Design a binder for this molecule. Sequence first.
Ligand code: ADP
Ligand code: SF4
Ligand code: SF4
Ligand code: ZN
Lengths: 194, 62, 416
Amino acid sequence: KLTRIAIVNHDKCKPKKCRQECKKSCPVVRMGKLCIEVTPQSKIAWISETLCIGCGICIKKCPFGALSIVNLPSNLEKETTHRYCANAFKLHRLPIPRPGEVLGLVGTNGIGKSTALKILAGKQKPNLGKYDWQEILTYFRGSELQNYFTKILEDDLKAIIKPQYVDQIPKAAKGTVGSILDRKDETKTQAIVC
Amino acid sequence: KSYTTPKKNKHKRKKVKLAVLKYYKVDENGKISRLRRECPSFMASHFDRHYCGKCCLTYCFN
Amino acid sequence: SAADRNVEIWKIKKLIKSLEAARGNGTSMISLIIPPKDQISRVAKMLADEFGTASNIKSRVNRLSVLGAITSVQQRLKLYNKVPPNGLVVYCGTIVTEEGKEKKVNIDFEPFKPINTSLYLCDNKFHTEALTALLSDDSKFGFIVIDGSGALFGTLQGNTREVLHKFTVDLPKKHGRAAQSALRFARLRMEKRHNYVRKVAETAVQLFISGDKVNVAGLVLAGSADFKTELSQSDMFDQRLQSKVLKLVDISYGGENGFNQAIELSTEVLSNVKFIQEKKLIGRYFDEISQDTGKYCFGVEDTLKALEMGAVEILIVYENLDIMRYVLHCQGTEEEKILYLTPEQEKDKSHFTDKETGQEHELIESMPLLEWFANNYKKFGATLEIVTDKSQEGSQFVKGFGGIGGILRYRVDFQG
RNA sequence: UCAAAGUUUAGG
RNA sequence: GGAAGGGCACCACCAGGAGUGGAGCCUGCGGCUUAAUUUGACUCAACACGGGAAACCUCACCCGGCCCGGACACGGACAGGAUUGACAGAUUGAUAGCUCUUUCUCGAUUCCGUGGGUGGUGGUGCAUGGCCGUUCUUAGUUGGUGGAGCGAUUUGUCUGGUU
RNA sequence: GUCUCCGUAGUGUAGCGGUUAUCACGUUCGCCUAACACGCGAAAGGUCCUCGGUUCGAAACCGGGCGGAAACACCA
Ligand SMILES: Nc1ncnc2c1ncn2[C@@H]1O[C@H](COP(=O)(O)OP(=O)(O)O)[C@@H](O)[C@H]1O
Ligand code: SF4
Ligand code: SF4
Ligand SMILES: [Zn+2]
């Protein structure tokens, strides 16, 4: 029980400079099947992970090093919460938020950590591997996400995020430290927090 | 029905009726001159022979 | 000679192909096969009863064609006085074909290799499943059969069960009824017993080797009392012979009555050798893809071009591949081109108009590529290695890589 | 006023 | 039915004859052989049978070649003559104008589709008809009405004698 | 190793120095039968294991070759 995941790094993948390459090196496409699709024009070199073998020929060939084929357990295919595009990142779960209980996320970055927080914040809709809210709640039943998402979708819960990049905030807001806290007062708890 | 390569078909003929055919010339408008020689019993100008086109008579001056 | 054998094999391969295509009416054909030990009189008796029973076939067309077919084979068998070695394979009938040409046919031949298969059949078509099944499995295995009584050596094609050599020995007793001499006689007994293993190992080098490289793709020891174990692991046993020891069989009985017991036990392991050689080769092919290297090829567009040029060293092929070599021809200008096409690109294809001149470019009939590879790999680079889709590495090679590839003589660049 | 005499396409 | 009563036939026997089987050849068939050795029929009821004694023809078989005898229509093809039919000489087996170079010609024939025919000693006698042969050369076979049986059936069409 | 014996048409065996090498089966060919079987009538087939010797003459008698098969191998 194992399956491949095709990935293309869109920052590096330029179809125009390299020509095709992947197509010319693929034993699926040299046979003659729709495994890899690029054309001279059109951005992002598409792959099907179904038709792909997982031989790692195309990854070695691509001149920028745009591609990657990593294997995942076939157990996880059932449990997708978010995959943004084909040949892209594929999150499989969300944490299980509890009310009045500080949720501790821990694990290395680039493993769907920001996507999870954005989904829980309610910016992103769980596309759930499709790429719809009753269908999403039904997917997340018997679990605290349906409790969490119901709450989100009628009672508009206020999504606020302490950001990762702290050095980007100074070049946006202006004035004194005391002035900004006075402007954002809702609780009126300046002093005790200070 | 395996037809052999070197034997092949044998194409039948194709005629060439090269427009209207001429056997006469105009001498002094009124009179006429005859080009080709005629049957005794237009017999053609074969490269050496003189072959008929009906009664199958033939001639050649040596 | 070796070349004359290969021509005789190809002759029979061609003949076999023409007989499977034959086709005929009801059950007018005969497929008959005779093993080498068999008597012809017994076969001629069998046909005489089959002739008698055929006399009461109700339908006309079938009946009269059968009887005449049975009479022909009876007369062919009168010419031989014995069934030759390698058996006999008699193929009678009255085949239908183009031009409405219901023609009588008879092909008796002693085949190359010995055949251990009997078969009587009548049918609408001929049945060469025995012959083609033989032609695939040329793989010989050896059988050394040790016993305290005496040894035996023999070989084993997919069908045929041979005896090469055997001897019997006057071995000593187990015990010595003196106290002092017990030990000396026991050493003496063990030295006689070792000399016997040596002789068997020597005779085994005599028989199974050929030009300092053994003919048998394997070798089996079969015995009891840990006597095969004495031979197998001994330094006496030559390592070129020892490295092909696949089974050490435990058998009741000894000699030729133990032989066929040893074969029955050794079946799965002797079948698996082809599967193991497949894995080893495609495993060697796949390592070049796993690394950078670049001493590989794949696809008829590439693999053939590689073979044409700076040639391959090994040319891996899947049996089933179905890709075929057509010869396209022009009506007027007499221009031609050959291409290697897939099952859908060969069956119907509007590509083949001449275009430049402006005519219909007729695709004159094919032959299909596994056969083409075999025809002239000798005039290229060679080692045409047929593989199956059974192994995990083979399955990838068939399903993924299109069942065609090769291990090259050096690094090669490719473009487009 | 008692010898021996077995068998019978898969091919409709 | 290697059950029993009767009664019969030289395609049964008896008593005999003439024989065939043995020899040579004539001829039919099966096989092998071949380019092809065309084929049908294999117990009586296949095999001096097909009326079958083939030099040619017959003739299907084989290997070579010409010819259309391709109706009629619908059309296309209609004349810058559609495109039937031609001594050479090379070739050819041929004195087949079959083909290549050339003649010139019926002059409304043609060529191409399609529909569609036509022909067929091609296949199927297990698709049939007719015609023969055989069971079967013996004495056998049938319904109406009546009677017997639920009925299939039987009775009539029979113990006996006689032919 | 010893001593012993046996190597005969396809199979199993006879064979008293002068034989067409005996018998049975098997084989082919007729017939019988619708066919087969049985049955009837015919036919063909031996390197007499191998070589050398003795002999007027050897399948045999004698020698050695190559095979095959029994009995012995005990007292410590
Ligand atoms: N809007 C987008 N469209 C296409 N690709 C994206 C987008 N956002 C992110 N990606 C790709 O997905 C990868 C991981 O992003 P993401 O999953 O958001 O980060 P994290 O794993 O930290 O949550 C990036 O390398 C990027 O190339
Ligand atoms: S991985 Fe090997 S197979 Fe799958 S696409 Fe890239 S190349 Fe073709
Ligand atoms: S993948 Fe690397 S190579 Fe294939 S197209 Fe996109 S960029 Fe060019
Ligand atoms: Zn004239």
